[PDB]
Amino acid sequence: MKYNPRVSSSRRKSRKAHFTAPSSVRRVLMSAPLSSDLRTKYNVRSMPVRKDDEVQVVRGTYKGREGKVVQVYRKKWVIHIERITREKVNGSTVNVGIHPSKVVVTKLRLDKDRKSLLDRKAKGRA
Amino acid sequence: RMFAPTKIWRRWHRKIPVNQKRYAVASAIAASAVPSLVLARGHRIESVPELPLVVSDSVESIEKTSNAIKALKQIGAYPDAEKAKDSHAIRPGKGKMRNRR
Amino acid sequence: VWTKSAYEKLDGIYGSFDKASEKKKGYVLPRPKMANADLARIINSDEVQS
Amino acid sequence: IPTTTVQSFENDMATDGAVPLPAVMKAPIRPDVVTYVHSNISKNA
Amino acid sequence: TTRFKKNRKKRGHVSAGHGRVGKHRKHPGGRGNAGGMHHHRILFDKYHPGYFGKVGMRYFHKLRNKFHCPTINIDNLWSLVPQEVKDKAKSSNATAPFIDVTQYGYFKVLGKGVLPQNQAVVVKAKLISKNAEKKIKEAGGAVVLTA
Amino acid sequence: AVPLLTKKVVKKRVKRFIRPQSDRRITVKESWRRPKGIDSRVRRKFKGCVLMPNIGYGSDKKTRHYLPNGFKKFVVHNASELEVLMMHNRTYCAEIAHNVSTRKRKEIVERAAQLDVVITNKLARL
Amino acid sequence: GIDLKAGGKSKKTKRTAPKSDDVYLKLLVKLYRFLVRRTGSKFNAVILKRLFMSKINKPPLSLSRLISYAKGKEDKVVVIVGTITDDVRAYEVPALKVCALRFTKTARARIEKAGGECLTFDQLALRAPLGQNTLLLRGPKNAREAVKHFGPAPGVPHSHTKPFVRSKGRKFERARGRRNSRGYKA
Amino acid sequence: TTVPGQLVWEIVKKNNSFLVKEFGNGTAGVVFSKEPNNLYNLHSYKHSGLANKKTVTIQAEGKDKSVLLATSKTKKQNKPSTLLNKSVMKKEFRRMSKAVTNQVADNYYRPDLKKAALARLSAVNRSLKVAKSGVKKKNRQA
RNA sequence: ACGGGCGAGAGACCGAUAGCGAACAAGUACCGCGAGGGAAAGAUGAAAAGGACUUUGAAAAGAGAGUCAAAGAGUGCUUGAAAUUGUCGGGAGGGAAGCGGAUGGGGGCCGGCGAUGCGCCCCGGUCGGAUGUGGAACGGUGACGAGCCGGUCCGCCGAUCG
RNA sequence: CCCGUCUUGAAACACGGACCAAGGAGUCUGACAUGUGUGCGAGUCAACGGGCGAGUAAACCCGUAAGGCGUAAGGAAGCUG
RNA sequence: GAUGAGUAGGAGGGCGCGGCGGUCGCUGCAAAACCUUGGGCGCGAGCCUGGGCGGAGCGGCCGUCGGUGCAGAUCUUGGU
Ligand SMILES: [K+]
Ligand SMILES: [K+]
Ligand SMILES: [K+]
Ligand SMILES: [K+]
Ligand SMILES: [K+]
Ligand SMILES: [K+]
Ligand SMILES: [K+]
Ligand SMILES: [K+]
Ligand SMILES: [K+]
Ligand SMILES: [K+]
Ligand SMILES: [K+]
Ligand SMILES: [K+]
Ligand SMILES: [K+]
Ligand SMILES: [K+]
Ligand SMILES: [Mg+2]
Ligand SMILES: [Mg+2]
Ligand SMILES: [Mg+2]
Ligand SMILES: [Mg+2]
Structure with a gap:
């Protein structure tokens, strides 16, 4: 049960906040869980999805497909993966949007900030 | 404009005498001790050792929800809680969009 | 489900028919219009059936 | 006076209950009064 | 409770119970107490005699506190005595209970009813009626004046 | 099931x-x-x-609300509600509610056949 | 056709059951329905009829009036279908056997202290199934404020009906129609 | 019924979780009761499983023509877990009928519903038999 | 105290003719010389995967074909009532039609529309069989004691029935 | 004989009504009154306010010589009761 | 056993709509809504149900509440 007086349980307000979120907030909202191996290694559960991250889809028609993320379309709330595509009536190839909550991160692109965030997340879990 | 537009100074509240409130509370407490009435109100009490159900004061020191569940199972009141949990559902009608989902 | 302490406090809270309550000033539990609601015991008693 | 048994948990050591039946447990049960009061006071929120 | 309103029972009856001929118009007899002397004279006279005119003297800036004077009858004096004091008075005939009716918020003692039989009572009050004093004296008590 | 009703059903008027x-x-x-x-x-x-x-125009009280088959209607929404007619199968017939799925309808039909309870619409959704 | 008023049907309405939803009152009504049916006692019929009546038709009886009416009949069980209230004007309370629908706390305390008993109507049936050796009493039905306003209109001759006034004083309905010096009197 | 059954009936006859009503409150109204200790599933003081200290329960046990005959214990009304004296009969219909009679009427437990108990036992036995071997006749000939 | 300003939390309130006039580039389009007046207008799909290509046509488009779970979802795209209209099929019609009651002709629909069981015997197959003797738990009454009475289940000797 | 309406009297040469969908009219509040249900009873009313409390607009508790109504009336009034 | 007319008007018992406190249920093995010379119940308000369509919710019962029931108003808006 919510107790903080500065947070609202209103459905309308929560929906408005989610659908008007700026890019910086959308990045956090577009988080995905880490794989079992990565979760065990880093002691972290979920991370924001990045461009060059390796991802395995776990839901939908592409449940077995995996690859490298190639675009994070925050405006559309979807990511794009290397070979997860389809053919139009024209015959050309287009990427299929996949929601990050429905995929699993198998390999992270590590930098100084990424390592700092991983350490910060692991510290709280202890 | 609607006919007879609604106004805030409608008599929303009621002032019931304290003695009648206490009468109602006593009646409800007495009814809670009748197993037939408790069953008739929809509670699954077929496994409770007896009514009124009085438990040791050590339950007041429980801190974890798992221990609370274990106590409920021990006293035979768990099936009612399980029934309550299983009935969780979305409210039909317009009330589901009025923050009562 | 009553804890033992609350069940014990019930007597001091709601008093009884004879004496008054400590927590409710001057309150006494109400009495029903019927002393014994077992209608069969009254209708089939020796006094009535005679 | 009737006596009510106190249920004992595994953790507790004593099974001493024997709490006298409170007088309020034998109060009159009046569905009409309860319904009237409940319906009236539920308006107050 | 809208569902119990009789207009609900009148849905589909055209006139809503106010008649086809007479109808329900805005103010067929005027507003409020209009016509108290002309076309509502019979009602005023038969149900509200004395309504019109003025009697008596005026009293500018009249304060009710200076007229405050609660009264208690002698038949209610005994109820003021606590139970233990009543028992003591019954046991001992050589003394009488001393009731200060002013401490209970009474100024004047009136003389309705009777006192307990063969019971002397000493009453102190701001005022007393002649009959109340006579009854107290007959009972064997006394009256004390205070302020 | 043999209906308990014996008096013939007489309608004072069959037109609306x-x-x-x-x-x-x-x-x-x-x-x-x-x-x-x-x-x-x-x-x-x-x-x-x-x-x-x-x-x-009122119907005779003995034959009132009786269906042409000689039983009275009772709407059942699941097999559990069917057992209420176990001791009234000579006076009451069961009609399965219009919104019941075919899967549950099969179970209701089987239970009623076990209980010798007449179903008015046992062929629905089959 | 037949020359009858309303086809020979009755046009009078009387209570046939309590309007109250009190379950205990309903049980008492069942008890006395059985008693009336299987005994044919006039006392039981009166009790049953009074059990149906409304609040204003079951006025309370004061303790002092009860003592006055029970004078010389203390051995009989006094029965009232209503409430019994205490009276601070009554000093000596004898031992009385009293049956009523309800007792006030003070009245019950005084009756029990005096050595009497307070009985319910089920206990009365157990004691007097046919009402034998009872004193059936009623409270003052017409002793209420609403009754004062009933009767002939205040403004007609020989009428002492109380009028409906928002306040009491010299300026409130005392001038014309109430005095010989202002128009007419009465 | 820790309080007298008549009061319980006065309370629950208006409403309870086991009450099933259909077709409104006019002439079309149909009423039934769901409580397992109601032999005829009828909403009446006689058969009520909530407003009677002594009640009869007859239902089919899980397996093997086992019929559960249970009666509420008169001195254990305040103990729901041990309120029912359960007896599981696996013998022929004749023995089951004899046992039901002995436990219902011969001991003056609830003689007024001996016929209801026997009819309920017969219905349960027939239902079990049909459930085992399936339907073999329509039971429509009068 | 607080129908303005900035920032929050709630509701037995309304749900696109409702709710602020305005859920939308609404005090907008538009009207008036002017003060002012003042609308209508929300919903493809999970994802555009928004219909390649063939053929007829001047073209809009049609006929095929393709996408999708679905086009019976094809960008004013969830669903799609009535008034009103076209087509096919049945029927009727000497200056209205419609309607109440009773039959009939034709059509449409209905198998709880309408049963095949029951009793007594013979043969065969399965399952159990005392008022006897032990065990397990339990009940009615009594006083949630004694005593009396009693059913369910399990194992045995007889009985040889159901 | 076409419904609705006003009317002594409507099928009217009396008025409204071409047709369909949606919307559409005895309500809320204050003062009284009878009746009925409920609580208490010579009393009754804690919600002005205070203590708290579902971490809480609820529920619960609190009347010191508080206050309202009732418990005494009649007089213009002094005043008596 | 007797009896049955009803405008204005009064009252009783019921039908129907949308919420709230409870309770019992249904639903992608297809909810609501809508459609139908399918069928049935009730004197009636209405109700239950077959079939179709639709593609995501809905209902029964006990209390309680309300912006709760249309053929008319040269009624309003839209459509024809
Ligand atoms: K009227
Ligand atoms: K009229
Ligand atoms: K003057
Ligand atoms: K608008
Ligand atoms: K569609
Ligand atoms: K029509
Ligand atoms: K007219
Ligand atoms: K006309
Ligand atoms: K007071
Ligand atoms: K004078
Ligand atoms: K009629
Ligand atoms: K519900
Ligand atoms: K239909
Ligand atoms: K409702
Ligand atoms: Mg008039
Ligand atoms: Mg059409
Ligand atoms: Mg005071
Ligand atoms: Mg509303």
């Missing part, structure tokens, strides 16, 4: 009581309404006009 002029104006529905007009010939009961319902 159609609202006056509902044949004339589309906006006037068939559901009965008693005319209240001052001049209404139907209200005045002029011969050769639309008939008005009255308590005199």
Whole structure:
């Protein structure tokens, strides 16, 4: 049960906040869980999805497909993966949007900030 | 404009005498001790050792929800809680969009 | 489900028919219009059936 | 006076209950009064 | 409770119970107490005699506190005595209970009813009626004046 | 199941009581309404006009609400509600509610066949 | 056709059951329905009829009036279908056997202290199934404020009906129609 | 019924979780009761499983023509877990009928519902038999 | 105290003719010389995967074909009532039609529309069989004691029935 | 004989009504009154306010010589009761 | 056993709509809504149900509440 007086349980307000979120907030909202191996290694559960991250889809028609993320379309709330595509009536190839909550991160692109965030997340879990 | 537009100074509240409130509370407490009435109100009490159900004061020191569940199972009141949990559902009608989902 | 302490406090809270309550000033539990609601015991008693 | 048994948990050591039946447990049960009061006071929120 | 309103029972009856001929118009007899002397004279006279005119003297800036004077009858004096004091008075005939009716918020003692039989009572009050004093004296008590 | 009813079902009237002029104006529905007009010939009961319902048409109490098969209807929404008729199978028949799925309808039908309870619409959704 | 008023049907309405939803009152009504049916006692019939009546038709009886009416009949069980209230004007309370629908706390305390008993109507049936050796009493039905306003209109001759006034004083309905010096009197 | 059954009936006859009503409150109204200790599933003081200290329960046990005959214990009304004296009969219909009679009427437990108990036992036995071997006749000939 | 300003939390309130006039580039389009007046207008799909290509046509488009779970979802795209209209099929019609009651002709629909069981015997197959003797738990009454009475289940000797 | 309406009297040469969908009219509040249900009873009313409390607009508790109504009336009034 | 007319008007018992406190249920093995010379119940308000369509919710019962029931108003808006 919510107790903080500065947070609202209103459905309308929560929906408005989610659908008007700026890019910086959308990045956090577009988080995905880490794989079992990565979760065990880093002691972290979920991370924001990045461009060059390796991802395995776990839901939908592409449940077995995996690859490298190639675009994070925050405006559309979807990511794009290397070979997860389809053919139009024209015959050309287009990427299929996949929601990050429905995929699993198998390999992270590590930098100084990424390592700092991983350490910060692991510290709280202890 | 609607006919007879609604106004805030409608008599929303009621002032019931304290003695009648206490009468109602006593009646409800007495009814809670009748197993037939408790069953008739929809509670699954077929496994409770007896009514009124009085438990040791050590339950007041429980801190974890798992221990609370274990106590409920021990006293035979768990099936009612399980029934309550299983009935969780979305409210039909317009009330589901009025923050009562 | 009553804890033992609350069940014990019930007597001091709601008093009884004879004496008054400590927590409710001057309150006494109400009495029903019927002393014994077992209608069969009254209708089939020796006094009535005679 | 009737006596009510106190249920004992595994953790507790004593099974001493024997709490006298409170007088309020034998109060009159009046569905009409309860319904009237409940319906009236539920308006107050 | 809208569902119990009789207009609900009148849905589909055209006139809503106010008649086809007479109808329900805005103010067929005027507003409020209009016509108290002309076309509502019979009602005023038969149900509200004395309504019109003025009697008596005026009293500018009249304060009710200076007229405050609660009264208690002698038949209610005994109820003021606590139970233990009543028992003591019954046991001992050589003394009488001393009731200060002013401490209970009474100024004047009136003389309705009777006192307990063969019971002397000493009453102190701001005022007393002649009959109340006579009854107290007959009972064997006394009256004390205070302020 | 042998119905307990023995008296023959007699209907004082089998025609509907159609609202006056509902044949004339589309906006006037068939559901009965008693005319209240001052001049209404139907209200005045002029011969050769639309008939008005009255308590005199009431059905005999012994055969009232009885279906042509000789049983009375009871709507059942699941197999659990079916057992209520176990001791009343000679007077009451079960009709499965219109919204019950075919899967549950099969279970209800099987249970009723076990209980010798007549189902009025046992072929629905089959 | 038949020359009858309303087709020979009755046009009078009387209570046939309590309007109250009190379950205990309903049980008492069942008890006395059985008693009336299987005994044919006039006392039981009166009790049953009074059990149906409304609040204003079951007025309370004061303790002092009860003592006055029970004078010389203390051995009989006094029965009232209503409430019994205490009276601070009554000093000596004898031992009385009293049956009523309800007792006030003070009245019950005084009756029990005096050595009497307070009985319910089920206990009365157990004691007096036919009402034998009872004193059936009623409270003052017409002793209420609403009754004062009933009767002839205040403004007609020989009428002492109380009028409906928002306040009491010289300026409130005392001038014309109430005095010979202002128009007419009465 | 820790309080007298008549009061319980006065309370629950208006409403309870086991009450099933259909077709409104007019002439079409149909009423039934769901409580397992109601032999005829009828909403009446006689058969009520909530407003009677002594009640009869007859239902089919899980397996093997086992019929559960249970009666509420008169001195254990305040103990729901041990309120029912359960007896599981696996013998022929004749022995089951004899046992039901002995436990219902011969001991003056609830003689007024001996016929209801026997009819309920017969219905349960027939239902079990049909459930085992399936339907073999329509039972429509009068 | 607080129908303005900035920032929050709630509701037995309304749900696109409702709710502020305004859920939308609404005090907008538009009207008036002017003060002012003042609308209508929300919904493809999970994802555009928004219909390649063939053929007829001047073209809009049609006929095929393709996408999708679905086009019976094809960008004013969830669903799609009535008034009103076209087509096919049945029927009727000497200056209205419609309607109440009773039959009939034709059509449409209905198998709880309408049963095949029951009793007594013979043969065969399965399952159990005392008022006897032990065990397990338990009940009615009594006083949630004694005593009396009693059913369910399990194992045995007889009985040889159901 | 076409409904609705006003009317002594409507099928009217009396008025409204071409047709369909949606919307559409005895309500809320204050003062009284009878009736009925409920609580208490010579009393009754804690919600002005205070203590708290579902971490809480609820529920619960609190009347010191508080206050309202009732418990005494009649007089213009002094005043008596 | 007797009896049955009803405008204005009064009252009783019921039908129907949308919420709230409870309770019992249904639903992608297809909810609501809508459609139908399918069928049935009730004197009636209405109700239950077959079939179709639709593609995501809905209902029964006990209390309680309300912006709760249309043929008319040269009624309003839209459509024809
Ligand atoms: K009227
Ligand atoms: K009229
Ligand atoms: K003057
Ligand atoms: K029509
Ligand atoms: K009639
Ligand atoms: K608008
Ligand atoms: K679609
Ligand atoms: K007119
Ligand atoms: K005209
Ligand atoms: K006071
Ligand atoms: K004078
Ligand atoms: K519900
Ligand atoms: K249908
Ligand atoms: K409702
Ligand atoms: Mg008039
Ligand atoms: Mg059409
Ligand atoms: Mg005071
Ligand atoms: Mg509303």
